[PDB]
Design a protein around this ligand. Structure first.
Ligand SMILES: O=C(CSc1n[nH]c(=O)n1-c1ccc(OCc2ccccc2)cc1)c1ccc(Cl)cc1
Length: 271
Protein backbone atom coordinates (compact mmCIF):
# COMPACT_ATOMS: atom_id res chain seq x y z
CA UNK A 1 0.00 0.00 0.00
CA UNK A 2 1.09 3.62 -0.59
CA UNK A 3 2.18 5.54 2.48
CA UNK A 4 -1.21 7.28 2.93
CA UNK A 5 -2.92 3.88 3.29
CA UNK A 6 -0.10 1.90 4.94
CA UNK A 7 -1.23 1.02 8.51
CA UNK A 8 2.41 1.24 9.64
CA UNK A 9 3.01 4.83 8.48
CA UNK A 10 2.96 7.36 11.32
CA UNK A 11 3.54 11.14 11.19
CA UNK A 12 7.07 11.99 12.29
CA UNK A 13 5.56 14.30 14.95
CA UNK A 14 4.38 11.25 16.96
CA UNK A 15 8.00 10.41 17.76
CA UNK A 16 10.50 11.88 20.18
CA UNK A 17 14.06 10.55 19.90
CA UNK A 18 15.53 10.57 23.39
CA UNK A 19 18.77 8.62 23.56
CA UNK A 20 21.17 7.63 20.81
CA UNK A 21 22.12 3.96 21.13
CA UNK A 22 24.31 3.60 18.04
CA UNK A 23 25.59 5.41 14.98
CA UNK A 24 27.05 3.80 11.89
CA UNK A 25 27.79 4.33 8.22
CA UNK A 26 24.08 3.95 7.34
CA UNK A 27 22.34 5.89 10.11
CA UNK A 28 21.54 5.90 13.81
CA UNK A 29 19.56 3.91 16.34
CA UNK A 30 17.72 5.71 19.10
CA UNK A 31 15.53 4.95 22.11
CA UNK A 32 12.46 7.12 21.80
CA UNK A 33 8.78 7.49 22.59
CA UNK A 34 5.72 7.23 20.42
CA UNK A 35 2.89 9.54 21.47
CA UNK A 36 4.68 10.44 24.72
CA UNK A 37 4.34 7.13 26.56
CA UNK A 38 5.38 4.15 24.49
CA UNK A 39 9.07 3.31 24.39
CA UNK A 40 10.30 2.31 20.92
CA UNK A 41 13.58 1.87 19.07
CA UNK A 42 14.01 4.21 16.10
CA UNK A 43 16.38 3.41 13.24
CA UNK A 44 17.09 6.33 10.92
CA UNK A 45 18.61 6.20 7.47
CA UNK A 46 21.52 8.53 6.73
CA UNK A 47 20.55 10.10 3.38
CA UNK A 48 22.86 9.12 0.53
CA UNK A 49 24.51 6.28 2.49
CA UNK A 50 22.49 3.46 0.90
CA UNK A 51 19.28 3.17 -1.09
CA UNK A 52 16.05 4.20 0.63
CA UNK A 53 14.45 1.22 -1.17
CA UNK A 54 17.10 -1.08 0.32
CA UNK A 55 16.58 0.40 3.77
CA UNK A 56 12.78 -0.02 3.71
CA UNK A 57 12.89 -3.54 2.33
CA UNK A 58 13.68 -4.64 5.88
CA UNK A 59 10.45 -3.11 7.26
CA UNK A 60 8.42 -4.63 4.41
CA UNK A 61 9.68 -8.08 5.28
CA UNK A 62 8.86 -7.54 8.98
CA UNK A 63 5.25 -6.81 7.97
CA UNK A 64 5.10 -10.51 6.91
CA UNK A 65 6.92 -12.01 9.91
CA UNK A 66 5.01 -11.13 13.03
CA UNK A 67 5.43 -13.38 16.09
CA UNK A 68 6.03 -12.95 19.83
CA UNK A 69 9.51 -14.34 19.41
CA UNK A 70 10.50 -11.85 16.68
CA UNK A 71 11.20 -8.13 17.15
CA UNK A 72 7.99 -6.47 15.97
CA UNK A 73 7.76 -3.67 13.42
CA UNK A 74 6.16 -0.73 15.23
CA UNK A 75 5.87 1.91 12.45
CA UNK A 76 7.63 3.58 9.52
CA UNK A 77 8.18 7.18 8.44
CA UNK A 78 8.84 6.96 4.74
CA UNK A 79 9.83 10.61 4.09
CA UNK A 80 13.50 11.58 4.48
CA UNK A 81 15.04 11.08 6.90
CA UNK A 82 13.48 7.61 6.69
CA UNK A 83 12.68 5.89 10.01
CA UNK A 84 12.01 2.26 10.85
CA UNK A 85 10.46 2.03 14.28
CA UNK A 86 10.57 -1.29 16.15
CA UNK A 87 9.80 -3.01 19.47
CA UNK A 88 12.10 -1.77 22.23
CA UNK A 89 14.17 -4.49 23.86
CA UNK A 90 15.33 -3.24 27.23
CA UNK A 91 18.40 -5.46 27.70
CA UNK A 92 19.82 -4.91 24.22
CA UNK A 93 21.74 -7.54 22.26
CA UNK A 94 22.29 -10.99 23.76
CA UNK A 95 26.01 -10.77 23.00
CA UNK A 96 26.22 -7.60 25.18
CA UNK A 97 23.68 -8.71 27.81
CA UNK A 98 25.49 -11.97 28.69
CA UNK A 99 28.53 -9.86 29.66
CA UNK A 100 26.65 -7.58 32.07
CA UNK A 101 26.61 -8.44 35.80
CA UNK A 102 23.00 -9.75 35.37
CA UNK A 103 24.02 -11.79 32.33
CA UNK A 104 27.10 -13.15 34.07
CA UNK A 105 25.02 -14.53 36.92
CA UNK A 106 22.61 -16.54 34.71
CA UNK A 107 22.52 -20.30 35.40
CA UNK A 108 22.97 -22.92 32.65
CA UNK A 109 19.25 -23.56 33.15
CA UNK A 110 18.37 -19.99 32.09
CA UNK A 111 20.88 -20.05 29.22
CA UNK A 112 19.15 -23.20 27.92
CA UNK A 113 15.76 -21.49 28.33
CA UNK A 114 17.04 -18.58 26.24
CA UNK A 115 18.42 -20.96 23.57
CA UNK A 116 15.02 -22.66 23.31
CA UNK A 117 13.29 -19.24 22.98
CA UNK A 118 15.59 -18.41 20.05
CA UNK A 119 14.97 -21.81 18.48
CA UNK A 120 11.26 -21.10 18.88
CA UNK A 121 11.52 -17.84 16.94
CA UNK A 122 13.61 -19.55 14.26
CA UNK A 123 11.05 -22.37 14.03
CA UNK A 124 8.43 -19.74 13.07
CA UNK A 125 10.78 -18.26 10.46
CA UNK A 126 11.32 -21.80 9.14
CA UNK A 127 7.58 -22.64 9.04
CA UNK A 128 6.92 -19.38 7.10
CA UNK A 129 9.45 -20.26 4.34
CA UNK A 130 11.90 -17.54 5.32
CA UNK A 131 15.60 -17.60 6.06
CA UNK A 132 17.48 -15.12 8.25
CA UNK A 133 21.15 -15.44 7.10
CA UNK A 134 22.59 -13.27 9.95
CA UNK A 135 21.72 -15.49 12.94
CA UNK A 136 24.18 -14.77 15.76
CA UNK A 137 24.02 -13.52 19.35
CA UNK A 138 24.49 -9.91 18.15
CA UNK A 139 21.11 -10.30 16.39
CA UNK A 140 19.14 -11.68 19.34
CA UNK A 141 17.64 -8.96 21.59
CA UNK A 142 16.71 -9.46 25.22
CA UNK A 143 13.65 -7.98 27.00
CA UNK A 144 13.34 -6.57 30.48
CA UNK A 145 11.81 -9.95 31.55
CA UNK A 146 14.85 -11.84 30.12
CA UNK A 147 13.00 -13.16 27.11
CA UNK A 148 14.77 -13.29 23.72
CA UNK A 149 13.61 -12.26 20.24
CA UNK A 150 15.07 -12.60 16.74
CA UNK A 151 16.14 -9.22 15.28
CA UNK A 152 17.81 -7.58 12.26
CA UNK A 153 15.98 -8.80 9.19
CA UNK A 154 18.15 -6.97 6.65
CA UNK A 155 19.41 -10.23 5.08
CA UNK A 156 16.25 -12.25 5.67
CA UNK A 157 14.51 -13.58 2.54
CA UNK A 158 11.34 -15.34 1.52
CA UNK A 159 12.24 -18.70 0.01
CA UNK A 160 10.16 -20.03 -2.90
CA UNK A 161 12.28 -23.01 -3.92
CA UNK A 162 14.15 -24.00 -0.75
CA UNK A 163 17.23 -21.92 -1.62
CA UNK A 164 18.50 -18.34 -2.03
CA UNK A 165 21.78 -17.79 -3.93
CA UNK A 166 23.78 -14.60 -3.20
CA UNK A 167 26.03 -12.89 -5.81
CA UNK A 168 29.42 -14.52 -6.25
CA UNK A 169 31.14 -11.43 -4.82
CA UNK A 170 29.14 -11.53 -1.58
CA UNK A 171 30.86 -11.79 1.82
CA UNK A 172 29.51 -13.17 5.10
CA UNK A 173 31.10 -13.68 8.55
CA UNK A 174 33.13 -16.85 8.16
CA UNK A 175 32.76 -18.13 11.73
CA UNK A 176 28.92 -17.96 11.78
CA UNK A 177 28.02 -18.86 8.24
CA UNK A 178 27.46 -22.43 6.93
CA UNK A 179 30.20 -23.78 4.61
CA UNK A 180 27.86 -24.12 1.60
CA UNK A 181 26.85 -20.46 1.89
CA UNK A 182 30.45 -19.27 2.20
CA UNK A 183 31.56 -21.55 -0.67
CA UNK A 184 28.67 -21.33 -3.13
CA UNK A 185 26.50 -18.49 -1.80
CA UNK A 186 23.65 -20.97 -1.38
CA UNK A 187 21.56 -20.28 1.76
CA UNK A 188 18.71 -22.42 3.14
CA UNK A 189 17.03 -22.71 6.50
CA UNK A 190 19.72 -25.40 7.11
CA UNK A 191 22.35 -22.65 6.81
CA UNK A 192 20.62 -20.80 9.64
CA UNK A 193 20.68 -24.11 11.57
CA UNK A 194 24.48 -24.15 11.28
CA UNK A 195 24.62 -20.53 12.49
CA UNK A 196 22.37 -21.46 15.42
CA UNK A 197 24.95 -24.05 16.49
CA UNK A 198 27.58 -21.27 16.49
CA UNK A 199 25.11 -19.06 18.41
CA UNK A 200 24.83 -21.77 21.10
CA UNK A 201 28.59 -21.41 21.67
CA UNK A 202 28.16 -17.67 22.18
CA UNK A 203 25.41 -18.44 24.72
CA UNK A 204 27.47 -20.87 26.78
CA UNK A 205 30.65 -18.73 26.67
CA UNK A 206 28.80 -15.54 27.60
CA UNK A 207 29.40 -13.92 24.21
CA UNK A 208 32.96 -15.07 23.45
CA UNK A 209 34.09 -15.22 19.83
CA UNK A 210 33.62 -18.72 18.20
CA UNK A 211 36.67 -20.88 17.38
CA UNK A 212 38.96 -19.54 20.15
CA UNK A 213 42.43 -18.58 18.86
CA UNK A 214 41.70 -19.30 15.19
CA UNK A 215 41.80 -17.10 12.11
CA UNK A 216 39.25 -17.51 9.36
CA UNK A 217 41.59 -19.57 7.13
CA UNK A 218 42.28 -21.84 10.12
CA UNK A 219 38.54 -22.25 10.72
CA UNK A 220 37.94 -23.14 7.03
CA UNK A 221 40.85 -25.59 7.09
CA UNK A 222 39.76 -27.36 10.29
CA UNK A 223 36.17 -27.69 9.05
CA UNK A 224 37.30 -29.20 5.75
CA UNK A 225 39.30 -31.83 7.70
CA UNK A 226 36.10 -32.76 9.56
CA UNK A 227 36.94 -31.03 12.85
CA UNK A 228 34.30 -28.87 14.44
CA UNK A 229 34.72 -26.12 17.03
CA UNK A 230 36.53 -27.41 20.10
CA UNK A 231 34.23 -28.07 23.10
CA UNK A 232 33.74 -24.68 24.77
CA UNK A 233 34.75 -24.34 28.42
CA UNK A 234 31.95 -25.40 30.75
CA UNK A 235 29.68 -26.62 27.93
CA UNK A 236 27.33 -29.46 28.92
CA UNK A 237 28.15 -32.43 26.65
CA UNK A 238 24.46 -32.64 25.81
CA UNK A 239 24.52 -29.12 24.39
CA UNK A 240 27.79 -29.78 22.59
CA UNK A 241 26.28 -32.83 20.83
CA UNK A 242 23.31 -30.66 19.83
CA UNK A 243 25.73 -28.07 18.36
CA UNK A 244 27.33 -30.93 16.41
CA UNK A 245 23.96 -31.86 14.87
CA UNK A 246 23.73 -28.25 13.66
CA UNK A 247 27.17 -28.69 12.10
CA UNK A 248 26.50 -31.81 10.05
CA UNK A 249 28.35 -31.84 6.73
CA UNK A 250 25.21 -32.29 4.56
CA UNK A 251 22.72 -29.45 5.01
CA UNK A 252 19.83 -31.88 4.83
CA UNK A 253 21.20 -33.98 7.77
CA UNK A 254 20.98 -30.92 10.02
CA UNK A 255 17.94 -30.88 12.28
CA UNK A 256 14.83 -28.67 12.00
CA UNK A 257 14.41 -25.66 14.29
CA UNK A 258 11.28 -27.25 15.70
CA UNK A 259 13.41 -30.24 16.77
CA UNK A 260 16.03 -27.91 18.26
CA UNK A 261 13.31 -26.09 20.16
CA UNK A 262 11.82 -29.26 21.58
CA UNK A 263 15.18 -30.70 22.59
CA UNK A 264 16.31 -27.47 24.27
CA UNK A 265 13.01 -27.30 26.19
CA UNK A 266 13.73 -30.82 27.52
CA UNK A 267 17.25 -29.78 28.45
CA UNK A 268 15.80 -26.78 30.26
CA UNK A 269 13.07 -28.66 32.17
CA UNK A 270 15.54 -31.35 33.19
CA UNK A 271 17.92 -28.70 34.62
O1 LIG B 1 21.64 -2.19 16.45
C1 LIG B 1 20.55 -1.85 16.86
C2 LIG B 1 20.45 -1.12 18.18
S1 LIG B 1 20.06 -2.25 19.48
C3 LIG B 1 18.31 -2.23 19.76
N1 LIG B 1 17.35 -2.29 18.84
N2 LIG B 1 16.27 -2.34 19.45
C4 LIG B 1 16.46 -2.30 20.78
O2 LIG B 1 15.56 -2.31 21.61
N3 LIG B 1 17.80 -2.22 21.00
C5 LIG B 1 18.48 -2.04 22.18
C6 LIG B 1 17.80 -1.87 23.39
C7 LIG B 1 18.42 -1.48 24.58
C8 LIG B 1 19.79 -1.27 24.62
O3 LIG B 1 20.41 -0.89 25.79
C9 LIG B 1 21.22 -1.81 26.53
C10 LIG B 1 22.63 -1.28 26.62
C11 LIG B 1 22.93 -0.21 27.47
C12 LIG B 1 24.23 0.29 27.55
C13 LIG B 1 25.24 -0.28 26.78
C14 LIG B 1 24.95 -1.35 25.93
C15 LIG B 1 23.65 -1.85 25.85
C16 LIG B 1 20.51 -1.41 23.43
C17 LIG B 1 19.86 -1.80 22.26
C18 LIG B 1 19.32 -2.11 16.02
C19 LIG B 1 19.28 -3.20 15.15
C20 LIG B 1 18.16 -3.44 14.37
C21 LIG B 1 17.06 -2.58 14.44
CL1 LIG B 1 15.60 -2.87 13.44
C22 LIG B 1 17.10 -1.48 15.31
C23 LIG B 1 18.23 -1.25 16.08
Amino acid sequence: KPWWEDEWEVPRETLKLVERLGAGQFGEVWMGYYNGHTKVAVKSLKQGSMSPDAFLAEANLMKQLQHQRLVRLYAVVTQEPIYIITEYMENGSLVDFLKTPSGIKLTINKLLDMAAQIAEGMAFIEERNYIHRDLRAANILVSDTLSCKIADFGLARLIEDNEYTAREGAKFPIKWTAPEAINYGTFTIKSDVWSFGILLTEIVTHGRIPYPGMTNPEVIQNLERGYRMVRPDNCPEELYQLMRLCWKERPEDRPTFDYLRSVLEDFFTAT
